[PDB]
């Protein structure tokens, strides 16, 4: 209908925390009414990371839209999408760097997905955008 048909599945690979396990790239939305009354929870679609895609507003806007549409796409139209989209990459190296939810926003024509520094195995790139959904 609108709010998925998997529900926080992330393909099976639920690498929450506990040591450097393995990376992921989790593509959904914080789909709210307008303010923050969550119609649908994210974390149902997830792809294994392959750096190359242009990590910018252009390919964040429609990218998350295609992910949720590849689950529902029945009652979904969108009033508006927020320009200040965000990526909450969380890197769980319990050795040196440690859990840091780096909630960087976005730029129009910034940059491609960068390399994972040195002191980390498992970045948790959370491609999650707050949007104002129209449920048709």
Curated annotation (Swiss-Prot):
Keywords: Pharmaceutical, Plasminogen activation, Secreted, Signal. The keyword tRNA-binding does not apply. One of its GO terms (biological process) is symbiont-mediated suppression of host complement activation by activation of host proteases. It is found in: Secreted. GO terms for cellular component: extracellular region. Potent plasminogen activator that converts plasminogen into plasmin. It forms a 1:1 complex with plasmin, which in turn activates other plasminogen molecules. Belongs to the staphylokinase family. This is Staphylokinase. The lineage of its organism: Viruses, Duplodnaviria, Heunggongvirae, Uroviricota, Caudoviricetes. The chain holds residues 28 to 163 of 163 of the full protein.
